Every structure is written in structure tokens, then in C-alpha cells.
UniProtKB/Swiss-Prot annotation:
Descriptive protein name: p51 RT
Effect ascribed to mutating M214A: No effect on RNA-dependent DNA polymerase activity. No effect on RNA 5'-end and 3'-end cleavages
Consequence recorded when altering L287S: 59% loss of polymerase activity. 8% loss of RNase H activity
Effect of D106S: 5- to 12-fold decrease in affinity for dTTP substrates. Strongly decreased RNA-directed DNA polymerase activity. Slightly decreased DNA-directed DNA polymerase activity. No effect on RNase H activity
Effect of I163V: 70% loss of DNA-directed DNA polymerase activity. 64% loss of RNA-directed DNA polymerase activity
Effect caused by changing W149Y: 58% loss of DNA-directed DNA polymerase activity. 42% loss of RNA-directed DNA polymerase activity
All copies of domain Reverse transcriptase, residue ranges: 40-218
Effect the entry attributes to changing L294S: 31% loss of polymerase activity. No loss of RNase H activity
Outcome of mutating L183V: 22% loss of DNA-directed DNA polymerase activity. No loss of RNA-directed DNA polymerase activity
Residues annotated to bind Mg(2+) 1: D106, D181, D182
Effect of L183A: 76% loss of DNA-directed DNA polymerase activity. 60% loss of RNA-directed DNA polymerase activity
Species name: Human immunodeficiency virus type 1 group M subtype B (isolate BH10) (HIV-1)
Portion of the full-length sequence here: 604 to 1027 of 1447
Length: 412
């Protein structure tokens, strides 16, 4: 019934961010949603004296036909003061990523039951644009905790704790984590038992008085991790050996003891690329030692919470993508691959967008925060099409790589 005082970072004004073009469908959806939100008092109209703006658009969650309002709060989130609660910060559960199965639940509607600090409300302003700007955009601001804002989980946390207390005390083995609008509940239980406990939890949440019927099931135990592998052949061409030496040279930036000398000795002389070259004993041994080295993990790879997670993605063709999450160059915290087909067969951007979402989810389950993506796409293409395929209630940060990486085929 009482609002907690909120302010921005020192020397920082509120966000002013242009509303990007919206399609007719999304505009109608947002009008219909915001009308009812206004009726329910969640939002209120504002006047010209509010300069601030945050972009808004519409999406659809996993397996649903219902439009959902998504506000992109990234600017406000980085401009709003770092919010440390009575918690003094929560250690991110390291058991969450070790659980057999992890279900994602949307708790977002709970935020709307808690009022927002009056003086900060002006900073949450947003616009529903009109087609061809033929009418003034409809301007709103939030009277309650907005979805997507950094302050909402921080503020609501004290409530969420005592809301989840009975369920947590009843099932102590279950690990629960909260990121933005999402509640991640992991456990080792069988899928049926898991789903029953999940239904139990959402029913318990609805009894606590808070679309929560959805769920998203991961399996961190079955997650993809990639060692560096070398080919095994009975016959090597000059080309094969050249590619091998290239890969080993690249892998020597990671693993110290990699030696290409005896293998490069075979490349001496100018021969046809397709000519078969028999391996000398020294070369074979060198290769063996190299494999041995490649089986061990990387030296001195640690996660530092003070730094940024960086995710790189490569398009390998045939609907296949490779990715690496890392902090420092050639120190890989995680690597993986996606062959996924969901409605994505002919569309590169749909694939890349789903990939970005999955990687972000993984990164949230593991380190409790989102990576900065380097996307193998032109800025204009991505900026144009990514919102069409976005199903997630959060958004990460991204940049663009316009020069083809040589390391592409070395990860495939
Ligand atoms: C009604 C309207 C009038 C108007 C006058 C001026 C000026 N100067 C700019 N205007 C805009 C943007 C309008 N808004 C609006 N909304 C939807 N359809 C239209 N069509 C339309 C408008 C004018 C003319 C003529 N002559 C012909 C067709 N206009």
C-alpha cells in the first residue's frame, strides 16, 4: 500500500528514446491492451510536460495467440540507480544450472499489484504511435511496477519471498531463481512429478492472489558443451593437413602446448591440394599429443561478476548455428550449437533471433545475467526484422560484425 522511493543515477535525466515504426496489428493490440490497463489504473494519460519516452511494441509468447505488450526499458534500466535491496544482493544459485529440469514461469502480472513511486512515474512514459503519424500518439505512464523494468523485481522481491515461503519450506530440494518477469524453478524430479509440482506452484501463486498458465521446460543436464575435435582419417590430402594446421594454430591461442611443426613439415614443397600425403611418425605423434591437450579444459577460466558476458554467434549453414559465451578472449565459459527448426526453415533472421533468445535464457540460468551479443548480421536488417520473432519478456544488448571471421569453420 506504500511506495518505495526510487531515483535515477546521479547526473542522469530520464530516458528519451524514439518510438520505432509499428505495424497496424501491433498498434491495435497495444491500444486495446492499454485501454484496459488504464481502466484498471495500471497506466495513466500524460501531458506535453513529460519529455521522456521509452519504446513499446507487441509480441506473442511461446505457443500462444494472445498479444502481449513489451516495453524496451534497456535505456531506463541502465539509467536507473543500481538497486540493492535488503538482500545486499542475491548470490545466483549455482544449483539451478545443475538441476535435471528447469521450468520458466511468467510472474509478470504480480508486479501490477504494487504501486510505483510518484516522482519516478514520469520516467516510465511511453507512446502508442499512429500509422503515418496522422493523429497524435497516445501517451501513457505507469502507476505501478512496470514489466521489464530493473526496479520491479528488486522492489517486489520482499513480497515474492514470503509468497514463496510455504512452497520452498515444503519442497527444500527445488531451486528457485527470479530474473525480471521470469521465475525459474528447477529440480531433479521426473517430468510428470515436475509438471505437477509446477501446477501446484502456479495454483499456490494464484491463491496468493496473482498469463501464469504458461511454462517453459529446459534441461541444463542435457545442455550442449563443445570440446575442440580434430579429424580422424586414414588418408590426408595437402588440403586436409593445411586446414588441420590452421585449426591447431588457432587452438594454440587457447591451449599452450599445441605444436604444428612436424605436421607443417609435411606441407613443405609445392604439391597438388588434393594429393594424398602420408603421415610421418613424428607428425602422427604430434597430432596425438595435440588431441591429448585438446581433451583437457582451458587453463585459468573463471567467471568474474564485475565484467560483461560476451556472446558470439556464427551461421554455419543448413539451419545450424554455433555460439560462444566468454568474458576474456580465448577463455570460453560456454560454447554450443543449434540445429533448431521451429517455423524457421527459410528465414535466417528468425533463426538468429530464436538463437539469441535461447542463449540469453541459458546465460540467465547459468550466471544470472544477459550477455552482450555480437551478431553476424547487418545493423539495418536486424533492426528491421528482430521484433517480429521476439517471444521473450527481456531484451539483451547487441552489436554487429561486418567482417567475416576466419574462425567460423573451426567451430564446425
Ligand atoms: C483530414 C486531414 C486533413 C488535412 C489537411 C492537411 C493540409 N493542408 C493535412 N491533413 C491531414 C494529414 C489530414 N488527416 C487525414 N487522415 C486520413 N486521411 C486523410 N486524407 C486526406 C487529407 C487531405 C486531403 C486534401 N486535400 C485529401 C485526403 N487525412
Amino acid at each position: 500500500i506504500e511506495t518505495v522511493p526510487v531515483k535515477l543515477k546521479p547526473g542522469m535525466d530520464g530516458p528519451k528514446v524514439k518510438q520505432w515504426p509499428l505495424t497496424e496489428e501491433k498498434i491495435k493490440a497495444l491500444v486495446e491492451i492499454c485501454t484496459e490497463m488504464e481502466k484498471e489504473g495500471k497506466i495513466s494519460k500524460i501531458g506535453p510536460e513529460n519529455p521522456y519516452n521509452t519504446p513499446v511494441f507487441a509480441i506473442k509468447k511461446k505457443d500462444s495467440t494472445k498479444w502481449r505488450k513489451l516495453v524496451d526499458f534497456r535505456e531506463l534500466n541502465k539509467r536507473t540507480q543500481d538497486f540493492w535491496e535488503v538482500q545486499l544482493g542475491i548470490p545466483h544459485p549455482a544449483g539451478l544450472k545443475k538441476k535435471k529440469s528447469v521450468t520458466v514461469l511468467d510472474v509478470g502480472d504480480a508486479y501490477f499489484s504494487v504501486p510505483l513511486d510518484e516522482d519516478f512515474r514520469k520516467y516510465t512514459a511511453f507512446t502508442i504511435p499512429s500509422i503515418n503519424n496522422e493523429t497524435p500518439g497516445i501517451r501513457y505512464q505507469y502507476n505501478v511496477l512496470p514489466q521489464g523494468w530493473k526496479g520491479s523485481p528488486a522492489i517486489f522481491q520482499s513480497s515474492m519471498t514470503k509468497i514463496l515461503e510455504p512452497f520452498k519450506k515444503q519442497n527444500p530440494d527445488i531451486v528457485i531463481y527470479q530474473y525480471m518477469d521470469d521465475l525459474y524453478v528447477g529440480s531433479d524430479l521426473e517430468i510428470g512429478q515436475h509438471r505437477t509440482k509446477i501446477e501446484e506452484l502456479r495454483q499456490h501463486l494464484l491463491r496468493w492472489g496473482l498469463f501464469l498458465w504458461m511454462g517453459y521446460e529446459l534441461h541444463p543436464d542435457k545442455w550442449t558443451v563443445q570440446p575442440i575435435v580434430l579429424p580422424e582419417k586414414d588418408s590426408w590430402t595437402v588440403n586436409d593437413i593445411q586446414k588441420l594446421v590452421g585449426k591447431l594454430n588457432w587452438a594454440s591461442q587457447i591451449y599452450p602446448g599445441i605444436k604444428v611443426r612436424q605436421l607443417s613439415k609435411l606441407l613443405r614443397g609445392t604439391k597438388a591440394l588434393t594429393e594424398v600425403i602420408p603421415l610421418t611418425e613424428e607428425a602422427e605423434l604430434e597430432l596425438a599429443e595435440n588431441r591429448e591437450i585438446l581433451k583437457e579444459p582451458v587453463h585459468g577460466v573463471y567467471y568474474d561478476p564485475s565484467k560483461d558476458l560476451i556472446a558470439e554467434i556464427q551461421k554455419q549453414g543448413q539451419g545450424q548455428w554455433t555460439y560462444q559465451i566468454y568474458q576474456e578472449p580465448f577463455k570460453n565459459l560456454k560454447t554450443g550449437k543449434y540445429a533448431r527448426m521451429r517455423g524457421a526453415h527459410t528465414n535466417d533472421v528468425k533463426q538468429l533471433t530464436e538463437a539469441v533468445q535461447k542463449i540469453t535464457t541459458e546465460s540467465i540460468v547459468i550466471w544470472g545475467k544477459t550477455p552482450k551479443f555480437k551478431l553476424p548480421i547487418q545493423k539495418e536488417t536486424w533492426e528491421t526484422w528482430w521484433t517480429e520473432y521476439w517471444q521473450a519478456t527481456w531484451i539483451p544488448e547487441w552489436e554487429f560484425v561486418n567482417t567475416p571471421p576466419l574462425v567460423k569453420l573451426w567451430y564446425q
